[model samples]
Target: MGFKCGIVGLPNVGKSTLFNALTKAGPFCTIEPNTGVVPMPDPRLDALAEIVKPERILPTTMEFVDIAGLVAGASKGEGLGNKFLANIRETDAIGHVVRCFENIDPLDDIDTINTELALADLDSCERAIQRLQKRAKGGDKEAKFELSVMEKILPVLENAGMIRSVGLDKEELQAIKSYNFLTLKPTMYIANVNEDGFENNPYLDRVREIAAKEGAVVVPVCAAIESEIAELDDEEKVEFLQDLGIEEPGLNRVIRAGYALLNLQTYFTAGVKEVRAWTVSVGATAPKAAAVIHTDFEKGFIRAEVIAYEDFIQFNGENGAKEAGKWRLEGKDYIVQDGDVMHFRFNV
Candidate 1:
């Protein structure tokens, strides 16, 4: 299945606006402020489906939860911050929108946003440290073992380093899974700049520097312009992009950033009815990627007939690829690569 990401920032940072533009959905439904799903657009899937003519085409989707604004002292339950923080913790990735342009009343500054997130992380870390301390004092052997690990983490947290920076291994990660630490999830910083500064905004450069330190991705976009573009019809939208001298839309950049942040790749299943896109981790095997379509496919998987999209395109189509011997059958252990076109042979 595809992953979920949360859109979060201080209120009025254009989180909802970005969500609308990405989902191609109508106005934000604030009734449920922190959860929503959006379909990922995959033109390559559509093209492959046109070539293959499969029975059905299912495009991959991404869920975007627009969590309420986080404020100062959020970790202490300020402004319903705890609820919002919990929502963020549940997401696979985080899309943090930062306002770059000046505004009359900025509720939370960019630095404050970082501080609030750090505070929330610290809160969780402190609670975890306390539990480990209690167990260590009780002379529980396993607890003592964990306390040793905590000792390594406590100082890092105290130094205001995010959990992501501590570099936990698989064992340590599993040990602390119960904490649901906010800093663990990958993040993408979206610099929401003014329309005029959309092309070469200095704000994005600053965001890039901070993101680099955290090993996160940064994307710059004009939320207001994108929101306006989202309202236009298909033909008008193309013309709009042409007029702006942009080859792609803002949503594309956002989606690319999300994919990069999650270390996700897209594979395709094509048919006449539809060409569909599937999302999986970068190094996913054939069976694992097949499992995304259906468990049965993975269970009874025989072999996969694979062709790279570019190869097929270079050969002028599927027949040409086959004529050039570019297509091959891959077994269960085959690692699926990005832009692969795959057909599975299964019993059920």
Candidate 2:
């Protein structure tokens, strides 16, 4: 149940710095490969932990893959570009780190990175078209349909536009889902700035413009400062950010944006042993959310005892919630909402 985002950008764009800062913020249960399985901080989880006084508190985690080697000619395998492009293809979305510190126009850096992404997708599109051409000409109906989808995507890539902008319908998207086109993935821009450059910076303004045009989001962060913040304790981190007149760490914004970019939501399982957050896609049904815990739960789901987060806060814990009549029994058809406190009943 991980939403994976690839951190990609041209070399020296503070991509690794941001990656390091982000990974440092994690108090996670697992680590695999080169990814940062960072916790998605939720205030509700803290409140639940406070009320239940659980022996352990587990927050849902998101995966950030640090893709370090992308350059101007990466589409042509420049600077291990093909490998990085392939790395990006496996991700659910992209967190493109745009350098706003030393550039005259961060837009130029954006263009350079985007051009490489488009070129890689163009290569993928052309190869798919070539493979489907024979089957399509031989009167294979499914091949013909997929070929048409690939053909529709080509012009967008050729024009240096993202495949996402081609506005493919649901079936067309399904047809090409296996292709994993890099440009088809949703993206967010991470504007890496100097310590004093979060506001009123021309470079950040340019990044914002590009992101707005693409319907993407921008997170402005001073990676160097965040790196320092990552090394501090809870009280010290709060003190440091407060001294800087900031309410929270920029890494928190980045993580939250990553969650939103992937259409992800969190639900909770609360008890004295643990009060843990679980990640699921938005609009997941009760059974589908139970499956996130285990397949047997989905297979044998009976009902979900649920409490809305607001209700849980108002009434304290489960006993208070039940007494106040805020508890509900949801069935398999129930669409799990964000911040739901749920306990699944099942037999296997």
Candidate 3:
């Protein structure tokens, strides 16, 4: 998956409606089981496509997994069982939906979802501690250090505390990446507001406050209006959004919100054959960014021809930008900037 966000919510929360809108509202949707690969809508990618006229212009994508329903009792092989839990575990982030029209509290819904995740993580944490102890006692130095880290994390999960809220040093935290704990993933709340209530959602503050405490973001989405917008042409979509007193569509915000939580940024590679968007961590090195294209690209390290997106546009396309001295060669140590247009010079 290019960029994946798992959709989870109780039944009748407009979860499926939002999922349909997200899949249909963006570029042509590609179905994969219950998942939809929505072509990421980026103005930059669109403009670059027009500018370069690539034979194959590929935009970055967002994958939304329709996880059906997560109910009150899901941990112990209940409604959701391990299948749903297992699905959500692999996602980069979570998008939780709660219907504002229903006689329910957004915070409560958020809690119920998280509580189940916490409970599920509890056993994993215990087992991790047991494994770490056995290894450390056998004098594995790495395990000894990890055991201490697990000790710090154990107390939090013991109290139904999320792994996210627990603090750890960089190296210490990286050691636990294999665990894939669901609560460890950042979450974005999608408040499915009434059409009229979208402009000034009553549940906004409570959801915001709860998200604040939980270190997450809340997005107000009118699934109904979004559905209507999905049926329109690109021009009409913009017009409809403008008429609704919004600059962009809700699913756009939803994708971006979830994308932000994934901690990825787009870099471009424009050519006559292809104008592609590739993702890398915000502050990744040039070589690391190249690795996103292929491990071999990074392995055969060489200097890179690079242009900042701003400079590229300001000076016109690549050749014009180069003539204006807006392009330069960067080395492996160069920190890849967001929207950098790079052509890595590499050999096998």
Query: Which candidate number would show the highest TM-score if scored against the true structure?
Result: 2
User: What is the alpha-carbon lDDT for the whole of candidate 3?
Assistant: 0.78
Model 1 over residues 1-348: C-alpha lDDT tens digits? 237777877777787788888766421123223246555656776566556666776766556667764555666775543577766767778888888776622223555655666777776677777887898798887777666666777777666566777777887877777777777777788888877866565666666667787777778888988898888886666767876665777777787778667778888876555566778999999989998888887678998889988986677566788899999999989999898988888852
Model 3 poorest 10 in a row by lDDT: 25-34
RMSD of 1: 4.2
State TM-scores per candidate.
0.86, 0.92, 0.87
Q: lDDT by residue for model 2 over 55-110, one digit each (tens)? A: 88888777888875646677888544357777776788998888887646777777
Q: After superposition, how far is residue 129 of candidate 1 from its true place, in Å?
A: 2.4
Writing each residue's lDDT as its tens digit, candidate 3 over 217-279 gives: 889888887677777776755556666566777678888777776787889999888888888
For candidate 3, the TM-score is 0.87
- By TM-score, rank the candidates, best first: 2, 3, 1
Off by over 4 Å in 3: 25-34, 78-82, 101-104, 134-141, 231-239
lDDT of each: 0.73, 0.84, 0.78
Candidates in descending lDDT order:
2, 3, 1
Considering every candidate listed, which one attains the maximal lDDT?
2
Looking at model 2, the pairs that clash are: none
Candidate number with the higher TM-score (1 or 2):
2
